[PDB]
Amino acid sequence: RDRKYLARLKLPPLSKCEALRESLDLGFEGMCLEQPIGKRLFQQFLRTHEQHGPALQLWKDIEDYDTADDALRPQKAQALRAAYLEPQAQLFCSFLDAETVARARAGGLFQPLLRAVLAHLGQAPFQEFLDSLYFLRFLQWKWLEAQPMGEDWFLDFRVLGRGGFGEVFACQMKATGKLYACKKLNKKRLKKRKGYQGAMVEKKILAKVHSRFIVSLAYAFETKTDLCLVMTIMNGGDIRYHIYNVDEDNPGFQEPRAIFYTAQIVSGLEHLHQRNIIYRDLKPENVLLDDDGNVRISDLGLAVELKAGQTKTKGYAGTPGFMAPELLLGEEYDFSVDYFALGVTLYEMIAARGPFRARGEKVENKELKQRVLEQAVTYPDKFSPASKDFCEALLQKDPEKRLGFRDGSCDGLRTHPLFRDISWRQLEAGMLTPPFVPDSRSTVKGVAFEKADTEFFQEFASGTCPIPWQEEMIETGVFGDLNVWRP
Amino acid sequence: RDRKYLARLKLPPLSKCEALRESLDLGFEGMCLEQPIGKRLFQQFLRTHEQHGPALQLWKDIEDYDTADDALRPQKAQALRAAPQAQLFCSFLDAETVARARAGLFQPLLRAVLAHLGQAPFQEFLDSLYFLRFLQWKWLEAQPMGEDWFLDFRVLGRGGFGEVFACQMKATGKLYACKKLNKKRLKKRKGYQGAMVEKKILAKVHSRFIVSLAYAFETKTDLCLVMTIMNDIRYHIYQEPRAIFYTAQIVSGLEHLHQRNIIYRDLKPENVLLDDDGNVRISDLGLAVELKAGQTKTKGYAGTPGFMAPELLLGEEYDFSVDYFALGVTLYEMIAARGPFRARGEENKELKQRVPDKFSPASKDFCEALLQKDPEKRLGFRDGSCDGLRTHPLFRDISWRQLEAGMLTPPFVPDSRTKGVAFEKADTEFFQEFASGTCPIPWQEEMIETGVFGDLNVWRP
Ligand SMILES: Nc1ncnc2c1ncn2[C@@H]1O[C@H](COP(=O)(O)OP(=O)(O)O)[C@@H](O)[C@H]1O
Ligand SMILES: Nc1ncnc2c1ncn2[C@@H]1O[C@H](COP(=O)(O)OP(=O)(O)O)[C@@H](O)[C@H]1O
Ligand SMILES: [Br-]
Ligand SMILES: [Br-]
Ligand SMILES: [Br-]
Ligand SMILES: [Br-]
Ligand SMILES: [Br-]
Ligand SMILES: [Mg+2]
Ligand SMILES: [Mg+2]
Ligand SMILES: [Mg+2]
Ligand SMILES: [Mg+2]
């Protein structure tokens, strides 16, 4: 917490909030439920006013119930049925409508109630909250957020890795002291290699999606030399390395780890596939690992957001030996190309070598294509009968008979027997402990800048992003330090 | 704290404060310095912002210094002088005034601390959540709190037009005196002009030696006044340090009245009440008179027999000097258990003509000063103060500073185990203009006192 940069984070007077009150889109779903500080302040309100008292505590205890470890769950539910649902009880929710109330005296979830309760809280109490000091403080924070936080605010302190157009650094947000990854894209070297359309898609995606299994874009700015991206740091390296450079002699992961890492990659893929995006570049080496032992997918630079009401899209692009046959041919394909790759990853994780390819036989794109479009998958004796069946499903060629995304979900994939020792609820939660925690050991000249480029660079350098900023603020405990009334 | 009436005390939404923002007069001197919750919220702001950090603590430690017991005082001052290039050094202080502190009273430093705080930091504060909360409170205050909110629980005494009750503010549970004036019995006895002057005065002045008007409303039968309860010097007669102490307060109360151009006119033991702590406050202002804007002296015959000064008894241009004369009669009657001019158990024209070894040489000389006839050679109010009275030798074992404060031990704590009338618009119109309602400062006190301000001024439990 560097004193000078920390002292910059200071709430503004109320007159500097006019503009936001209008300019801000924020209504309920976004403000009080989606945004960390908004949820915080909205609940601080609900807390301090007695009428909402029960609705808040019912709202909280449902959340706690959903992230409750299996062996507690049914106990907590009993206690919750008592505190908030029992007729003529102390914190009895009266606003709940008979039908919905008596429904929650049956069950293995409390999902109607969260809808029923937030439907309420968003209606009137939200309006009471809008006409309150808390709301005004909420703006105060939305302002502080909107202030400029560029390359000044980030101390680059280590090299996490080399990328295409520049080094990915590890860095600390000078003010709050939170460690981020800083992916730096050289301005000239982008232009020269005609990579705008990529670099941008990545910025647009990472900042658009928020999920624990994708890297999260926190900040995005330019320098006079590079376009930087600040994103959830991933010290743990990447799945490729952690096959071939952990126990070099005894290669690859054991089945529970391979499954667990797939589990997250699947959940991350789903999130992308629910928002009509094709990852297109799935492979171990772009599936990063955090300090805690969990994974997140990365390098969206060759992703593609399918268009508003678009079933499938064309385009040739990807990694050799990970590209699905229907793509390799060059036809109308959809999400099913990613799941194909997923299987190659789950194969290579366990086997320490690609499915179709041997180790040390690097070859032609037309040769490997034939090896994809026409070859049967051989599975060694390291596999279990569950894993073999899973991979086969993902590694088929025909996308109308390949396991993947169906009817808004992957639940058809999740039921597959391979996922026995898995609590999907907790996986999406964060509770589930990972099995393995890590511990690891100029240019040419020609392209000068024009007006037409810089307008992109600024449209790239969006700035600080709402939710991940608000997290950092609460995370680092600067929100506490600042959201104070009577010391 | 009656749950139903306590639950009425609830801060309003910010939309119900627009009106007050304009309708309220409140600027700095009044808001942040004079009003309890305003002072509170203004300080909470100063506290939560780092830049003002020192100025708030200097501002607090000066206050604490002024109310500091003699034997600590100079120690605290040294510590305060400590707290150039220092940790919480006030930089905004101007070199000249900065020196003063060393070259010794920190009265003019406070006057330059507040000069600052009221300038810019106040403007920062007006553009803050704390100011908005301040209005929230000013609104709750302005809501109607009539005869509903007061449980009458005992009779403190009988008055002219009705019984003075002891009562509790149902919501916060604070004990008040409830002086009830019967509407018909006022009118019939032509007492409006009086009853009103009293309401106007008690609510106008705020001092620890005068009763304080908290609320004032009407019922369908009476005009009520809620005021600082006082569970009287007359009864408590029928020693010199006590007589002096009681006078000391009565003088300080009289000064406050005399600095605001008012003559009490009805000074006598029996209307100088005593609180549970053992301190006194003057009372029954009904025959007072606020001298007019740029008015030296006023006429009028009114007062209590054997307490009225000669220059008044004649009927001439008189001023505050009539009160001080009475003061002396009170100090005489206190020590002697009998009036000065009059014996025990013995006409207005006779007493007018008329207008021991228990005394000390200091008391005798004080009384004689107050009990002289000629008001141009009588001890009293001079050039904006009574300091000429305060220096008189009778006030030896007296720390005036602490007397005004509240610190000084009272030399005696009491015992805690002791038809034919019709109304018109012209009347009702008065009764409403009498029934003003709840009063800013004393209300805001009650709220902090009873700790409902804490319970309500909450942010994150
Ligand atoms: N958020 C991150 N945390 C830790 N390391 C990262 C992060 N992002 C990238 N890296 C490292 O830097 C390398 C290059 O990043 P990448 O985005 O894959 O470059 P490119 O977009 O040119 O493919 C990766 O192989 C990885 O090891
Ligand atoms: N605040 C109080 N607390 C307790 N008793 C009081 C209080 N105020 C007045 N009393 C008692 O009630 C009596 C009537 O009030 P007072 O002002 O004397 O009536 P009037 O206005 O007719 O002179 C007083 O003499 C005193 O004994
Ligand atoms: Br509020
Ligand atoms: Br580190
Ligand atoms: Br392969
Ligand atoms: Br504020
Ligand atoms: Br607080
Ligand atoms: Mg890469
Ligand atoms: Mg890339
Ligand atoms: Mg009386
Ligand atoms: Mg009277």
CSV table of N, CA and C and ligand atoms in Angstrom, one decimal, chain A residues 160-165 168 181 183 202 215 231-235 238 285-286 288 298-299, ligand 1:
chain,number,residue,atom,x,y,z
A,160,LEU,N,6.1,-12.9,-15.8
A,160,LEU,CA,5.4,-14.1,-15.8
A,160,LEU,C,5.5,-14.9,-17.0
A,161,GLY,N,5.9,-14.3,-18.2
A,161,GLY,CA,6.0,-15.0,-19.4
A,161,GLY,C,6.2,-14.1,-20.7
A,162,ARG,N,6.7,-14.7,-21.7
A,162,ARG,CA,6.8,-14.0,-23.0
A,162,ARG,C,5.5,-14.3,-23.9
A,163,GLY,N,5.0,-13.3,-24.5
A,163,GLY,CA,3.9,-13.4,-25.4
A,163,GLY,C,4.2,-13.0,-26.8
A,164,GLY,N,3.2,-13.0,-27.7
A,164,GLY,CA,3.5,-12.7,-29.1
A,164,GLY,C,4.1,-11.3,-29.3
A,165,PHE,N,3.4,-10.3,-28.9
A,165,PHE,CA,3.8,-8.9,-29.1
A,165,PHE,C,4.5,-8.2,-27.9
A,168,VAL,N,4.5,-10.6,-20.8
A,168,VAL,CA,3.5,-10.6,-19.7
A,168,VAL,C,4.2,-10.4,-18.4
A,181,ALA,N,-1.5,-9.7,-13.4
A,181,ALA,CA,-0.7,-10.0,-14.6
A,181,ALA,C,-0.9,-8.8,-15.6
A,183,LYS,N,-0.3,-8.0,-19.4
A,183,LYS,CA,0.1,-8.4,-20.7
A,183,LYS,C,0.3,-7.2,-21.6
A,202,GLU,N,-10.0,-10.0,-27.7
A,202,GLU,CA,-9.5,-10.5,-26.4
A,202,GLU,C,-9.9,-9.5,-25.3
A,215,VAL,N,-9.8,-16.0,-17.2
A,215,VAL,CA,-9.0,-14.8,-16.6
A,215,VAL,C,-9.9,-13.6,-16.7
A,231,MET,N,-4.9,-8.2,-15.5
A,231,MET,CA,-5.8,-9.3,-15.4
A,231,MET,C,-5.5,-10.3,-14.3
A,232,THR,N,-6.5,-11.0,-13.8
A,232,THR,CA,-6.3,-12.0,-12.7
A,232,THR,C,-5.0,-12.7,-12.9
A,233,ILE,N,-4.0,-12.5,-12.0
A,233,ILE,CA,-2.7,-13.1,-12.0
A,233,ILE,C,-2.8,-14.7,-11.9
A,234,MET,N,-1.9,-15.4,-12.6
A,234,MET,CA,-1.9,-16.8,-12.6
A,234,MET,C,-0.5,-17.4,-12.4
A,235,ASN,N,0.0,-17.3,-11.2
A,235,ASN,CA,1.4,-17.7,-10.9
A,235,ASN,C,1.6,-19.2,-11.3
A,238,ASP,N,1.2,-23.2,-16.3
A,238,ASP,CA,0.2,-23.7,-17.2
A,238,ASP,C,0.2,-25.2,-17.4
A,285,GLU,N,-1.5,-25.5,-23.0
A,285,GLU,CA,-0.5,-24.4,-22.7
A,285,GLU,C,-1.2,-23.0,-22.6
A,286,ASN,N,-2.5,-22.9,-22.9
A,286,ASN,CA,-3.2,-21.7,-22.7
A,286,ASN,C,-4.3,-21.9,-21.6
A,288,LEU,N,-4.1,-21.6,-17.8
A,288,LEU,CA,-3.2,-21.2,-16.7
A,288,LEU,C,-3.7,-21.7,-15.3
A,298,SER,N,-7.4,-19.1,-21.0
A,298,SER,CA,-6.7,-17.8,-21.4
A,298,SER,C,-6.4,-17.7,-22.8
A,299,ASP,N,-5.8,-16.6,-23.2
A,299,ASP,CA,-5.5,-16.3,-24.6
A,299,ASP,C,-6.8,-16.3,-25.5
C,1,LIG,N1,-2.8,-13.7,-16.4
C,1,LIG,C1,-1.6,-14.3,-16.5
C,1,LIG,N2,-1.0,-14.8,-15.4
C,1,LIG,C2,0.2,-15.4,-15.5
C,1,LIG,N3,0.8,-15.6,-16.6
C,1,LIG,C3,0.3,-15.2,-17.8
C,1,LIG,C4,-1.0,-14.6,-17.8
C,1,LIG,N4,-1.3,-14.3,-19.1
C,1,LIG,C5,-0.3,-14.8,-19.8
C,1,LIG,N5,0.7,-15.3,-19.1
C,1,LIG,C6,1.9,-16.0,-19.5
C,1,LIG,O1,2.5,-15.3,-20.7
C,1,LIG,C7,2.5,-16.1,-21.8
C,1,LIG,C8,2.0,-15.3,-23.0
C,1,LIG,O2,0.7,-14.9,-22.8
C,1,LIG,P1,-0.4,-15.0,-24.0
C,1,LIG,O3,-1.6,-14.1,-23.7
C,1,LIG,O4,-0.6,-16.5,-24.2
C,1,LIG,O5,0.3,-14.4,-25.3
C,1,LIG,P2,-0.3,-14.4,-26.8
C,1,LIG,O6,-1.6,-13.7,-26.6
C,1,LIG,O7,0.7,-13.8,-27.7
C,1,LIG,O8,-0.5,-15.9,-27.1
C,1,LIG,C9,1.6,-17.3,-21.5
C,1,LIG,O9,2.1,-18.5,-22.1
C,1,LIG,C10,1.6,-17.4,-20.0
C,1,LIG,O10,2.6,-18.3,-19.5
